[PDB]
Design a protein around this ligand. Structure first.
Ligand code: A1L12
Length: 110
């Protein structure tokens, strides 16, 4: 059922938070601290910021109708990173390693 795939989405997000991915996952745990980093143009270029904490809140508040809507937010998080940053930047390399974890689990969902 729809509520079985949303249970898997929780498991996928929990995995993305787990210790074994912590070295490359941490930049996506919470909203980009644009204040502290002095990224004055970030909110102008990124219209819909997204992060794993915001996704966790939305998932616990059952604001995702299906896995596809959860998926769109995970991919928005990564797209925001790929959009703002050059391809050589360390955060892009970290995004890709975490996205690979997401894409494999998301694809193998029953
Ligand atoms: C100095 C921060 C930064 N500067 C850039 C640019 C550098 C350059 C000028 C202009 C346009 C550029 C080309 C991208 C800004 N991008 C970032 C950037 C983008 C990020 C991003 O998309 N995500 C998802 C996370 C981070 C980020 C966030 C944080 C906290 C404070 C926890 O919010 C710390 C460090 C971050 O990014 C870095 C990272 C992940 C690894 C690294 F080695 C250095 C970072 C600055 C960043 O930092």
């Amino acid at each position: 059922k729809v509520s079985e795939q949303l249970k898997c989405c929780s498991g996928i997000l929990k995995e993305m938070f787990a210790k074994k991915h912590a070295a490359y996952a941490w930049p996506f745990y919470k909203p980009v601290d644009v204040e502290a980093l002095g990224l004055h143009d970030y909110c102008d270029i990124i219209k819909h910021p997204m992060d794993m904490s915001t996704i966790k809140s939305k998932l616990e508040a059952r604001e995702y109708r299906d896995a596809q809507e959860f998926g769109a937010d995970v991919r928005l998080m990564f797209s925001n990173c790929y959009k703002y940053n050059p391809p050589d930047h360390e955060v892009v390399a970290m995004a890709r390693k975490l996205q690979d974890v997401f894409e494999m689990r998301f694809a193998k969902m029953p």
